[PDB]
Design a protein around this motif. Structure first.
Motif, short mmCIF file in Angstrom:
data_model
loop_
_atom_site.label_atom_id
_atom_site.label_comp_id
_atom_site.label_asym_id
_atom_site.label_seq_id
_atom_site.Cartn_x
_atom_site.Cartn_y
_atom_site.Cartn_z
N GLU C 80 -0.10 -7.67 16.86
CA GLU C 80 -1.20 -8.62 16.44
C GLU C 80 -1.78 -7.71 15.17
O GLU C 80 -2.71 -6.64 15.24
CB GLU C 80 -1.92 -9.51 17.42
CG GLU C 80 -1.62 -10.39 17.65
CD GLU C 80 -3.47 -11.07 17.96
OE1 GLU C 80 -3.81 -11.07 17.73
OE2 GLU C 80 -3.31 -11.78 19.11
N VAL C 81 -1.42 -7.38 14.18
CA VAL C 81 -2.58 -6.91 12.77
C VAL C 81 -1.89 -7.94 11.89
O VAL C 81 -2.09 -9.14 12.13
CB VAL C 81 -1.65 -5.33 12.11
CG1 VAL C 81 -1.43 -4.56 13.64
CG2 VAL C 81 -0.37 -5.80 12.31
N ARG C 82 -2.38 -7.51 9.87
CA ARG C 82 -1.95 -8.04 9.31
C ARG C 82 -1.54 -7.39 8.51
O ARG C 82 -1.21 -6.76 8.03
CB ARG C 82 -3.65 -8.57 8.54
CG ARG C 82 -4.04 -9.74 8.81
CD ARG C 82 -5.15 -10.08 8.76
NE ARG C 82 -5.21 -11.50 8.91
CZ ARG C 82 -7.16 -11.88 8.48
NH1 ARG C 82 -7.36 -12.04 8.21
NH2 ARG C 82 -7.49 -13.48 9.34
N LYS C 85 -1.76 -2.67 4.11
CA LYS C 85 -2.84 -1.71 5.29
C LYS C 85 -1.28 -0.21 5.68
O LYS C 85 -2.00 0.29 6.30
CB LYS C 85 -3.19 -2.25 6.16
CG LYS C 85 -4.51 -3.97 5.36
CD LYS C 85 -5.44 -2.90 5.67
CE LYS C 85 -5.94 -2.58 7.22
NZ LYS C 85 -7.63 -2.32 7.20
N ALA D 1 -7.93 -15.32 16.02
CA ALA D 1 -7.31 -14.75 15.52
C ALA D 1 -7.18 -12.58 16.22
O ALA D 1 -6.24 -12.32 16.38
CB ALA D 1 -7.13 -14.29 13.28
N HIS D 2 -8.61 -12.13 15.83
CA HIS D 2 -8.48 -10.88 16.56
C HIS D 2 -7.29 -9.81 15.97
O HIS D 2 -6.21 -9.52 15.55
CB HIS D 2 -8.50 -11.26 18.35
CG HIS D 2 -9.41 -10.46 19.03
ND1 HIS D 2 -8.92 -8.60 18.80
CD2 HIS D 2 -9.86 -10.52 20.20
CE1 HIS D 2 -9.94 -8.04 19.59
NE2 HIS D 2 -10.57 -9.32 20.55
N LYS D 3 -8.09 -8.87 15.18
CA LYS D 3 -7.01 -7.98 14.38
C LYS D 3 -8.10 -6.97 14.98
O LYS D 3 -9.10 -6.71 14.08
CB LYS D 3 -8.34 -8.44 12.60
CG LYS D 3 -6.97 -7.19 12.31
CD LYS D 3 -7.72 -6.37 10.88
CE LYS D 3 -7.12 -6.92 9.04
NZ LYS D 3 -7.53 -6.75 8.85
N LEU D 6 -6.24 -1.07 13.09
CA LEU D 6 -5.94 -1.06 11.84
C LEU D 6 -4.91 0.39 11.67
O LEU D 6 -5.28 1.30 12.65
CB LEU D 6 -5.78 -1.62 10.87
CG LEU D 6 -5.76 -3.27 11.13
CD1 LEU D 6 -4.86 -4.11 10.14
CD2 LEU D 6 -4.64 -3.13 12.86
N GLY D 7 -5.27 0.85 9.75
CA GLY D 7 -5.63 2.42 9.39
C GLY D 7 -5.34 2.31 7.70
O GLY D 7 -6.08 1.21 7.74
N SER D 8 -4.63 3.35 7.24
CA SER D 8 -5.08 3.40 5.84
C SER D 8 -4.08 4.36 5.74
O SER D 8 -2.79 4.23 6.01
CB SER D 8 -6.34 4.29 5.90
OG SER D 8 -6.46 4.70 4.12
N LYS D 48 23.07 26.60 -32.94
CA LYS D 48 22.43 26.80 -34.55
C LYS D 48 21.92 25.45 -35.46
O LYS D 48 22.36 24.08 -35.34
CB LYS D 48 24.46 25.56 -35.02
CG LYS D 48 24.96 26.48 -36.02
CD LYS D 48 26.42 25.31 -36.54
CE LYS D 48 27.63 26.54 -37.20
NZ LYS D 48 28.82 25.90 -37.65
#
Lengths: 99, 185, 141, 84, 60
Positions: C80-82, C85, D1-3, D6-8, D48
């Motif tokens: 459950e992410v998107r 990223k 939805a619920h997110k 996450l990250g980078s 040469k």
RNA sequence: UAGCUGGUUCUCCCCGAAAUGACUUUAGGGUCAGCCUCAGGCGCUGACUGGGGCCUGUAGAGCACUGAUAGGGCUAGGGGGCCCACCAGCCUACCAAACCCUGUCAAACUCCGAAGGGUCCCAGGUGGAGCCUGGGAGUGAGGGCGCGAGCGAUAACGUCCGCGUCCGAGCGCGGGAACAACCGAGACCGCCAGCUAAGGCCCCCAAGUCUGGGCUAAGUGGUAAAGGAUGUGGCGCCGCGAAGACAGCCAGGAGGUUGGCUUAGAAGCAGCCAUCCUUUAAAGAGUGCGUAAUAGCUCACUGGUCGAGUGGCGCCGCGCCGAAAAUGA
RNA sequence: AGAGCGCAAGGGUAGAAGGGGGCCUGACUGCGAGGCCUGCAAGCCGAGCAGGGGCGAAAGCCGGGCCUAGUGAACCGGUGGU
RNA sequence: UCCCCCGUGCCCAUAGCGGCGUGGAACCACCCGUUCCCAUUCCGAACACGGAAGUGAAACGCGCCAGCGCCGAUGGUACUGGGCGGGCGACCGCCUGGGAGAGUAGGUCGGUGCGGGGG
């Protein structure tokens, strides 16, 4: 072991491929590319004398005339272990102008 | 033993294959013609051969000549032969793989243990005048952890060797059970 | 199971897997064998599952060898992410296996033994396989 | 939805690809000051009337045409020979 | 060198631009176009490039 | 003010695009070249391809760099003991540097290395090729299919690049049941004329219920898997057999024995090893059921009858179970 | 050639770019043929020329560093000179 | 014209290793003296300057062997322009041309021109 091609630092233009060894002095002047040589002059391998240093003198100058017969003016003394103690024939007076 | 042969012409294998003929090449010292056989009896006979037994190819050319096998390239996909090489024999000391028949039921064996089938087929230099059939290999007194190798094997009077000889021809290895479910840890 | 404990790249791209085994359909090891039919990864989870089902069924059995080895990094994104990223995670440590490759072989068993065993062991894996003897395989190293 | 978390990353960084390669070959007239080999290490050693610079780059010293050479125990050679 | 002779059998619409450049290199206009040609490995290869849109005959 | 929405008017003729690269308080706007257009100039140049010369490390593949890699063998050291000191011995179903062998893996590994692309040289190639200067543009959300890679989960009518194309602008045409992009195929106009493409010919709907032989019994066709079965056709392999077999039927089907080992008992028969010998034509240290374990039944095996084929293992084509969701098929 | 070659890695190198000593100071001046690169702009390469300078017996090398990173157009103004 | 060697260069290991046999009559090399030229972060080893007696082991030149090392045909296949189906995909097939390494056979310790001396 003295390669480095000192001959590459002599690929500059026109060669004088030689080597010294115990009894004989192999003072040769060589046209390159095709490696077609020209002017030789030796110790007693030219049937001259027996001491390399004196021979040298005389030989270079003998060699001078040889060079000066075939339209020769300047090259470069070829040797890596040369050290250059001159042998003040040093093929300088010996045709080349040398030094 | 006996097998048929026919000269290959230079027709693309694709046909020769898709019909029923098995394409291949033969040679000796410099000779190098191209040939073909027929899968079924070729397969059936090769089982009683490989580089362990000698083969004979009779040819509708007026000449029937025997060879040994060598280098067999395969289909990979669906697994089966699709080409063979056959080195023509001689009588001058040749090198290839003689079979080693495992013989002996010692302590590694019986008390568990499994033989390490390393080199049944071994590189030896034997004069094609002599033919070493089934070189026996003494297992009669070996225990797990140990092995057998080198000149320990049978060296028939008409056969010379040239591998290492160091190369372990065989060994005995420990069995497994639910004790590796302890290892599972 | 099994894998490196520290290799070279945590992540690596999926790739394309068409066929040809690359090399490995003969023997030099076992006396019966199990060989793949499709170009897929085999998961080390499934791999050890087979190893199990095998040595499991036949207890006190001899030695089995695995010619394959699960050394492919699977990229599993968090649940459950998107989109975008980042990427996945060093999950699913598996191996690249194409049809005609000897996954694994038995030696020291019995006939019907090696049969039923490798039969089930193969029935586990995410495919289907071939149970093979040892005769033609001779030579090729 | 619920997110949730996450990250980078850290890899959205690329090196501006600089056009490298060999420009002139045997069959082409190159006349005095024409670069013909772009490289980093000695992929192509001069000779040469050929030239090298402050970054291993071969060019033309003469109004001559290129040609190549292979000398294993020395390296790879380019020789731009002209006319007699 | 014998004379070559070719038509156009298969539509140009939906195929590589190179092949169509060969179709110009011949002069092949619309469908059904009988063409008088000269033999030479050049034009031979040019036409071999379209070995499917084109009917072949070496009229002598 | 309005980088935004909206409107933007007659006719025909000629050509005809882009829906990118760079940079931007730049991201649905923009200036620069690229792709179009007109004028004039320069002439076989251009796409294309034939030969020749050279540049190239992707695919594959291999393992010589490098990492990983199973397995064995060998072996520094180390686990440990016996066992001393001037210091050493010795041993293992232990750990492991390296090496040898056994196989092995890789975008950022590369000994080899294609197909291919690239570019110069000579050659042909007359086409809305090409070059050169000059005025007018617009265009910079693009999309699908195709293979080659990323990402996603080797999901998405998902997005991201590359070569390749169709759309857009070809919703003009015919197949595809209907459908911008699948197949076929470039519409100046008329025609109550001929061929033909793609699909197609039993009738829609135009044309063979043509020709000839193979498979199948399911409406499969008329859209599903691992897997499963004495479905059916065809191929192949190893015994059995006219000395007499498959099967049926009659009968013998045994003795050490309760094998030992275990176990409350384990007697062919809940379990480890095993891994016999004999009376005999033939009968096992047993194959199932059953027993509290014995018992019994029982198959194995070998004769009596019999009278002609039989048992198994693998393959290929088509099928059948596998197979359930919502207004009516 | 797995060492090292400042720093990341790539490419490269022991027929030196690596490491030791001697004189030095071409991180030179006025120019730049002709090419890389490319939307512009900026960046990249350098023969030769002439002034003089350093080392070299000489032949000869030198317009910084083995290379690719260490960079900021212009407008404004500081400062010394012409 | 060629033989042996010295100076030399070109092919890029089929030219290299290793084992071995042979030459010093001109050479080459060790050797020899360390006063002179000259230098070593220390060594007359190294570079040297001056060279009688000797040596042919070591240096090397030529020869024989493949054990190591390098090359590797020829059959077949991988993958692939270009063309065309089949599969839900994962993927598989055919023609046309293009054509590897893997390895088997076998190859190979040399090829060669300028100059110099002796015969």
């Amino acid at each position: 072991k003295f390669r480095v091609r000192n001959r590459i630092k002599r690929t500059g233009r026109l060669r004088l491929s030689v080597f010294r060894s115990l009894k004989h002095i192999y003072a040769q002047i060589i046209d390159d590319e095709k490696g077609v040589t020209l002017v030789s002059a030796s110790s007693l391998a030219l049937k001259l004398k027996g001491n390399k240093t004196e021979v040298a003198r005389q030989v270079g100058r003998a060699l001078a005339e040889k060079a000066l017969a075939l339209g020769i003016k300047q090259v470069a003394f070829d040797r890596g272990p040369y050290k250059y103690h001159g042998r003040v024939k040093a093929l300088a007076e010996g045709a080349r102008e040398g030094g | 033993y006996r097998l048929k042969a026919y000269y290959r012409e230079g027709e693309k294998p694709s046909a020769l294959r898709r019909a029923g003929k098995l394409p291949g090449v033969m040679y000796n010292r410099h000779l190098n013609r191209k040939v073909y056989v027929d899968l079924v009896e070729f397969d059936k006979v090769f089982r009683q051969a490989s580089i362990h037994h000698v083969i004979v190819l009779e040819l509708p050319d007026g000449q029937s000549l025997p060879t040994l096998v060598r280098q067999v390239n395969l289909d990979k996909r669906r697994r089966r032969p699709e080409h063979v090489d056959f080195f023509v024999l001689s009588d001058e000391p040749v090198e290839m793989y003689v079979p080693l028949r495992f013989v002996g039921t010692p302590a590694g064996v019986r008390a568990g243990g499994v033989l390490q089938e390393i080199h049944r087929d071994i590189l030896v230099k034997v004069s094609p005048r002599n033919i070493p059939e089934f070189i026996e290999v003494d297992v009669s007194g070996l225990e797990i952890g140990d092995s057998l190798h080198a000149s320990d094997l049978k060296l028939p009077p008409g056969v010379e060797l040239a591998v290492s000889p160091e190369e372990t021809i065989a060994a005995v290895v420990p069995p497994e059970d639910v004790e590796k479910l302890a290892e599972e840890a | 199971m099994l894998m490196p404990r520290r290799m070279k790249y945590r992540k690596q791209q999926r790739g394309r897997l068409k066929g040809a085994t690359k090399g490995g359909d003969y023997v030099a090891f076992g006396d019966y064998g199990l060989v793949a039919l499709e170009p897929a990864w085999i998961t080390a989870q499934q791999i050890e599952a087979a190893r199990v089902a095998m040595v499991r069924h036949f207890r006190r059995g001899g030695k089995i060898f695995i010619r394959i080895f699960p050394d492919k990094p699977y990229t599993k994104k968090p649940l459950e992410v998107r989109m975008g990223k980042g990427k996945g995670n060093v999950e699913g440590y598996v191996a690249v296996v194409k049809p005609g490759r000897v996954m694994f072989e038995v030696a020291g068993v019995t006939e019907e033994q090696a049969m039923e065993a490798l039969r089930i062991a193969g029935h586990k894996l995410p495919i289907k396989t071939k149970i093979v003897r040892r005769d033609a395989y001779d030579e090729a190293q | 939805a619920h997110k949730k978390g996450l990250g980078s990353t850290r890899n959205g960084r690329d090196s501006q690809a600089k056009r490298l390669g060999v420009k002139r070959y045997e069959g082409q007239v190159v006349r005095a000051g024409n670069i013909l080999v772009r490289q980093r290490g000695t992929r192509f050693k001069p000779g040469k009337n050929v030239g090298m610079g402050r970054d291993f780059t071969l060019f033309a010293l003469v109004d001559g045409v290129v040609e190549f050479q292979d000398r294993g125990r020395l390296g790879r050679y380019v020789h731009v020979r002209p006319l007699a | 060198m014998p004379r070559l002779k070719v038509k156009l059998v298969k539509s140009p619409i939906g195929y590589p631009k190179d092949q169509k450049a060969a179709l110009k290199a011949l002069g092949l206009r619309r469908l059904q176009q009988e063409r008088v040609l000269e033999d030479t490995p050049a034009i031979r290869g040019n036409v071999e490039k379209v070995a499917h849109l084109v009917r072949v005959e070496v009229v002598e």
